Amino acid sequence: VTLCSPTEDDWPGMFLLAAASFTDFIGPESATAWRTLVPTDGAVVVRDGSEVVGMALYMDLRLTVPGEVVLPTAGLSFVAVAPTHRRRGLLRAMCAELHRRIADSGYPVAALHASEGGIYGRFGYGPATTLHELTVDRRFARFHADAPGGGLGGSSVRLVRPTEHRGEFEAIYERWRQQVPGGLLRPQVLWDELLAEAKAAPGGDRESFALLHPDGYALYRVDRTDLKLARVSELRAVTADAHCALWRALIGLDSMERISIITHPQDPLPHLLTDTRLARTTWRQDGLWLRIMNVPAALEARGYAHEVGEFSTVLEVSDGGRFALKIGDGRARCTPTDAAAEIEMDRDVLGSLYLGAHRASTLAAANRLRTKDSQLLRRLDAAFASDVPVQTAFEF
Amino acid sequence: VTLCSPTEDDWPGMFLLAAASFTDFIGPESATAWRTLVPTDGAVVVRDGSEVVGMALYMDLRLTVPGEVVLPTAGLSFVAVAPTHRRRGLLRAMCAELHRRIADSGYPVAALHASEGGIYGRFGYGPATTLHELTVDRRFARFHADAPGGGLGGSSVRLVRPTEHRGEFEAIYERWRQQVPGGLLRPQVLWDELLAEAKAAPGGDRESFALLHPDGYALYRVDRTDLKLARVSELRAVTADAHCALWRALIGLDSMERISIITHPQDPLPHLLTDTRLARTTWRQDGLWLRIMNVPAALEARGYAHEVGEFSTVLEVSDGGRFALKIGDGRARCTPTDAAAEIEMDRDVLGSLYLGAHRASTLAAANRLRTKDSQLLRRLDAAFASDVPVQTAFEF
Amino acid sequence: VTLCSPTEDDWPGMFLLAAASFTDFIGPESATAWRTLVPTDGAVVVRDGSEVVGMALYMDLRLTVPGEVVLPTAGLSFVAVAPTHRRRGLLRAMCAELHRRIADSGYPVAALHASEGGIYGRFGYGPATTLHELTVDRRFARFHADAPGGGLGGSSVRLVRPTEHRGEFEAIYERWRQQVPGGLLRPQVLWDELLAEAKAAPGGDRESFALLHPDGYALYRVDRTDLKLARVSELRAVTADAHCALWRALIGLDSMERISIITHPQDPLPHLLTDTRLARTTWRQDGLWLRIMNVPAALEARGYAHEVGEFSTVLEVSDGGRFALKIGDGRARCTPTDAAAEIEMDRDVLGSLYLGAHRASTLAAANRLRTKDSQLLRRLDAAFASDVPVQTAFEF
Amino acid sequence: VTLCSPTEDDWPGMFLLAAASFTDFIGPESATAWRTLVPTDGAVVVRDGSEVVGMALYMDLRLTVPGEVVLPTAGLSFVAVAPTHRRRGLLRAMCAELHRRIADSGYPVAALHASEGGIYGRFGYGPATTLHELTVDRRFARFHADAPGGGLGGSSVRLVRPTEHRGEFEAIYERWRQQVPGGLLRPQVLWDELLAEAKAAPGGDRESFALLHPDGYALYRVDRTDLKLARVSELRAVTADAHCALWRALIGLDSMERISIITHPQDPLPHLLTDTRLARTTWRQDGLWLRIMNVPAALEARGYAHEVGEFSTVLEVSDGGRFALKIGDGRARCTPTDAAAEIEMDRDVLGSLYLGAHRASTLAAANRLRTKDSQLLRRLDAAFASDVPVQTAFEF
Numbered sequence A, B, C, D: 001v002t003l004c005s006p007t008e009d010d011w012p013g014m015f016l017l018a019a020a021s022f023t024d025f026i027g028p029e030s031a032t033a034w035r036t037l038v039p040t041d042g043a044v045v046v047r048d049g050s051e052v053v054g055m056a057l058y059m060d061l062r063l064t065v066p067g068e069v070v071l072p073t074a075g076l077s078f079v080a081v082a083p084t085h086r087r088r089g090l091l092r093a094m095c096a097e098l099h100r101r102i103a104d105s106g107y108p109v110a111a112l113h114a115s116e117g118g119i120y121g122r123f124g125y126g127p128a129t130t131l132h133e134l135t136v137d138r139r140f141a142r143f144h145a146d147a148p149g150g151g152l153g154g155s156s157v158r159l160v161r162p163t164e165h166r167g168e169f170e171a172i173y174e175r176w177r178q179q180v181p182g183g184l185l186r187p188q189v190l191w192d193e194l195l196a197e198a199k200a201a202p203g204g205d206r207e208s209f210a211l212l213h214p215d216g217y218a219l220y221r222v223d224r225t226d227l228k229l230a231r232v233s234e235l236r237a238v239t240a241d242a243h244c245a246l247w248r249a250l251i252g253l254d255s256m257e258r259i260s261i262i263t264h265p266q267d268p269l270p271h272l273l274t275d276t277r278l279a280r281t282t283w284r285q286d287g288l289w290l291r292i293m294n295v296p297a298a299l300e301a302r303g304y305a306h307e308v309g310e311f312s313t314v315l316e317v318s319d320g321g322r323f324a325l326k327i328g329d330g331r332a333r334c335t336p337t338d339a340a341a342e343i344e345m346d347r348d349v350l351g352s353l354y355l356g357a358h359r360a361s362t363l364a365a366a367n368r369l370r371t372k373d374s375q376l377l378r379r380l381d382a383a384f385a386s387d388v389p390v391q392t393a394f395e396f
């Protein structure tokens, strides 16, 4: 068992491991696009004597955090151990090497989408965003009097072929990702990939349609099997008007019984309707997971709630450092100290708090976050909260 | 069509209307217990010429709000129009009369549990708490190292017959309801009713069991049809230790595949497990609905976040008054004014904000809450938030 | 194997055979009511050497036929062979003896409800009425402008306890059964039985409610398991106004998603709605089966379409006689002849034609009805048709 | 918003609207065949300022009506409003313009297949044929002694590839459509299309097989997912012998559990079996919808029952004219009058009566058809009835 950077000869062995480990595999011909996001030394493989029995890599990503700050992010992906080589500490070795490389390269944070919720906590990954599926029975949906864009005149929304309006979608997304915590820069190769999935596949997914507004878009397709269900794959709205106009159009798909979307807990859609209950939550799951690589750099980089008074404390991350933490005027200063710790938590807990998706009070109730001062807990709660609700950009 | 207070002769007609309008009817012999909570003049009926074709009443309740303040609450229940008399404005007439009576009696707030989510908004009722069903696959559930009560020695939890420990359940509940927003005083007649439902019914519900801790309890029964599913009907925990100890015991029901509970969004259970995903959200719905009867009295009665600086504004409720609102040191002063309104909202929106379950930002995004100052929105958000997460006490 | 009339000692053996042969058994204590409709010599049993291994009886019924004529009808019921004694010609022997008795007693027709559709044809029983289940999604149901009782004022329909309005239901039913082909006289013992099934059963059927009009009623209960489905067990309407008023009330059961009723193919309900498709046909099956015992007596007893000119023919029933048939002024004369047969059919086919539910053309297309004159076929079609659509009264 | 005839440049915009409005879309390359049936000025589109936001067209069809008379029929199809432009009266404007064009062109009737049952009544379209799905459990199916083609010798039915016997299918269909009310002329381009759907599609529909008789054919394929179910897509039989022979062959598909067919209520198949119940009705729905464009021309063009005596009346269609109607010797004369109306009905009701599928008595019971003379109702019933049962030709 050897652990090293893959050579060009190693990749066919990696794609074989990938096909047997991931069911949703797009093959090795759309792997060209995703490979461009893997830096030199971004990947590790484990050989037996010889076939690939273990692999893992990171991708160079740009992650928006509260205060509209953009962090270089190491995106963990393509992590697999052969079924022949389980319970052999290969994952632990591969994860330890990549984290070494990611830290030495100067990434403040790493991120991943979890295949299971029970693996990544012990690696210091905490769930940081929440996926929220809403299903609307659009046959009963009436918009509230208070809702925008209910007046006469034309709709500002057009039904369009996605492939013909790439430039417009990019510019809306680019604005969206820069102003929303959880936002990711979407490179050109991923727009290429997104608009190739937009066409109908033979005995597969149906043609994608687009609803386009000056300040928003929605990509949707009818479900393969349930022909009364429209799945919104992606809805990006920069303004409240765009979000309403796009939903007014989706509720007007008169041949559909149900619109479903994977969105965030704070999606205002339920409040646009006279009956909030018509937008049922049909699924909830952790979205993006964060490992804080550098505590001082990550805590100093993000903005904090202006609405909490200046305060100071000592934060200990288990095997991650102890820090004098001082937060005021929505900025933090995080400096080394050996003074008595007022707050203790494992590294994964800090990832979970970092984007505002989880409350310090909630993690404290489960004893994942230790302090003896409930005042300090209320202050952490308020300071780490996000004015702009945290969303999930796209799976990697 | 006449609208008046029912006489003793009217109640058999009301029970007939009730049987035909509500499927979950416990009959007229457990209606004796619930009737004790209806004050003199708490009920209206509509007769045709003569049978009961319309009814509605309120019950005298005590509702805990943020700051551990207990408000007299008019609990709307038993609202029905005969299928023979729909679309005749009977509900509008009955609701207008009860609201007249509730206001004149000096109730600051009214509350209800909604049969449908599309009826009650136009009456100034906003959804104020969120029901959150968690289902645990307890076969995979391992408690986190950080979780409390994982050490050796005895369990502080006992498996007991509910009927034999009424006094203990009352005292824990009484502590719970006083410290939690959404908490309701549970009168003796409702403890009588709760412990009569605890015994097995012939070709019906199975026997209820209780897990008792000094500072918490859990009532659960196996599902009628799914014999691998335990439904926790009620879990009241005053301390984090009690909540963990009770969940450790429930995860030890080795003959069950699944534990389900209807809880609140901030339940710390997912964070007690090594795999947060094992506690799936399988259902979400609005719980208690609030109508603010008296805006000044309700806004002044509750506590506000100490962690936001003193601030002042002018609040207009549509057909509910305009008010100079001044919040600081976690107290509000709400006084009449004709000065230009900075915040506008319908009455139902204020009910939705009142217990901290919904964010002003979220309601603002849907244009249910109008202001031109985003700073003022952040301040409302922070001030109306609840330190103690809001829960739902019991259905009425 | 002996075939004779049962003695009082034989009935416990018959009830044992009944319990093992029929799953929907109401026991031997509601068998007292149904036994009153069995005449002396109405029953046969087969013993082995001794237990009951075979039984069959008829009940004295009154059946309305086209022209509002009421015929004495032998109602076959309680027919069973022990699982120990199949393929032994016991059914053939029992059916031959009862038919001997029924004919000698002077019954023009026999009738039954079929447990299977493949048994009774060879005994000369033809399906004569059609059961038609309509399910309305009442959430979309709007009444047509043209529909009756859409104006202001009170509803003429009352929601009532069935047990309190027995007299009213009897008088409406009594009018209904006399004016509708397929109508049965419902004796007092069967009203006793019907209103005992109207109360809720412990871990069984839910309480029955009644909608009462001067000229109609509807009995309905919520389904045991599907709590959004109301089953209308029985709807008797003497006028079009009563039928609409009752359906307006049923569509007003706002807690239900679906109303289902077992009705007849010509039920006007679909045409009362702006969307005829909302009343889906979810089930169709043969209802009452007729064996014509005496061809001349049965053909002469019923009325014929006044709208077809006088005509004459020769009808042969296979092993049932040949007859000169002369129809005009809505009366028939049926007399013996040896003249060449113009129409041939088995006896079961005549039962199927007798109430107007099946067209001679349709049975001719399947060669169940032979003639060489298509003019004569059109004339039979028109003459045997029923002005008043044929309905099914009640199962026996 | 402009309403005009589409130009060649408008059609790609129409196909985009079509893809987003209809899930069962065959694309724009089989749209060439269907476009040949659209006359010059057969289509309208609505543009916004510019994309197609509304479209509708008619096709030139030939519809057989009672008396084997063939009417030029305007077949409405391809009707869609963009989800962006609902509740803007675009459908009303497009339908009013096409109906203007259809009337001025001299079409006596228009027809459509309804996407929903609640749209087309207000446009004067009445459901005129009834689709009836029969499912046979062919494992229990035994043919009656009386049924044709049960004797020895060869089967007159051959199992064949459809593509190799186009000429034979055309000639049988051509005979069928000319002798059956509801029959449509099937042009060459639609035979091209029908035999292209007969071959297996990759990850789609299975290969179609044909059973060919001198006087009938049946096209069937195994269901995609249920491999024990054969769907008969089309069965055309000119004689009773052909219908039996084809069904004898289908019942001989020994690898199938179930044969299903969409047929008409008067299909004689149930009567060919010893057990009529084995042919279950598993689905019922309205088929073709008729709008009578010219009342006098349509009423005079069709044949009437010879078996009803000569009679005269005055018929008023709401906003459609008042007419002296005189029916005798199976012909009608329909002439202008201002004499008192004896029969009133909306235009849609007349479409529903026109092919004999619905009885005047049934529509009268729902007050869709007003008269004060029940004798006149019986006469309408009998006269409008169809000797040959009405069938549905093919969807457009």
Ligand SMILES: Nc1nc(SCC(=O)NCCN2CCCCC2)nc2sc3c(c12)CCCCC3
Binding pocket: A022, A024, A025, A026, A030, A031, A032, A034, A035, A038, A057, A059, A077, A078, A113, A395, A396
């Ligand atoms: N990181 C990549 N993503 C995608 S599609 C976006 C997505 O939903 N990912 C979650 C699921 N995921 C799909 C297959 C892989 C592993 C698991 N496609 C590819 S292809 C590929 C990579 C990759 C990884 C980086 C470069 C090697 C080849």
Ligand SMILES: Nc1nc(SCC(=O)NCCN2CCCCC2)nc2sc3c(c12)CCCCC3
Binding pocket: B022, B024, B025, B026, B030, B031, B032, B034, B035, B038, B057, B059, B077, B078, B113, B395, B396
């Ligand atoms: N307010 C009452 N609650 C209950 S059980 C607790 C519950 O889950 N209620 C929601 C469902 N609900 C059950 C039946 C009634 C209306 C709807 N039982 C009764 S019985 C009764 C009332 C009442 C209302 C007040 C006094 C008259 C009789």
Ligand SMILES: Nc1nc(SCC(=O)NCCN2CCCCC2)nc2sc3c(c12)CCCCC3
Binding pocket: C022, C024, C025, C026, C030, C031, C032, C034, C035, C038, C057, C059, C077, C078, C113, C395, C396
């Ligand atoms: N003829 C009778 N009907 C009924 S309930 C009405 C009904 O839906 N019948 C169809 C089903 N059926 C139920 C049980 C018996 C056989 C099959 N109950 C009884 S009880 C009984 C008879 C009978 C038959 C005549 C007298 C002996 C005892």
Ligand SMILES: Nc1nc(SCC(=O)NCCN2CCCCC2)nc2sc3c(c12)CCCCC3
Binding pocket: D022, D024, D025, D026, D030, D031, D032, D034, D035, D038, D057, D059, D077, D078, D113, D395, D396
């Ligand atoms: N009238 C047409 N029919 C068909 S397939 C036969 C069928 O089952 N139609 C009902 C469903 N229908 C399918 C797609 C269209 C609208 C709805 N295909 C096409 S393609 C097409 C038309 C058309 C309409 C006339 C010319 C433009 C393009």
Ligand SMILES: [Cl-]
Binding pocket: A038, A039, A040, A041, A042, A043
């Ligand atoms: Cl690489």
Ligand SMILES: [Cl-]
Binding pocket: A262, A392, A393, A394, A395
């Ligand atoms: Cl996503």
Ligand SMILES: [Cl-]
Binding pocket: B038, B039, B040, B041, B042, B043
């Ligand atoms: Cl009272």
Ligand SMILES: [Cl-]
Binding pocket: B262, B392, B393, B394, B395
């Ligand atoms: Cl609850």
Ligand SMILES: [Cl-]
Binding pocket: C038, C039, C040, C041, C042, C043
């Ligand atoms: Cl007897």
Ligand SMILES: [Cl-]
Binding pocket: C262, C392, C393, C394, C395
């Ligand atoms: Cl029945």
Ligand SMILES: [Cl-]
Binding pocket: D038, D039, D040, D041, D042, D043
């Ligand atoms: Cl054209």
Ligand SMILES: [Cl-]
Binding pocket: D262, D392, D393, D394, D395
């Ligand atoms: Cl068809």
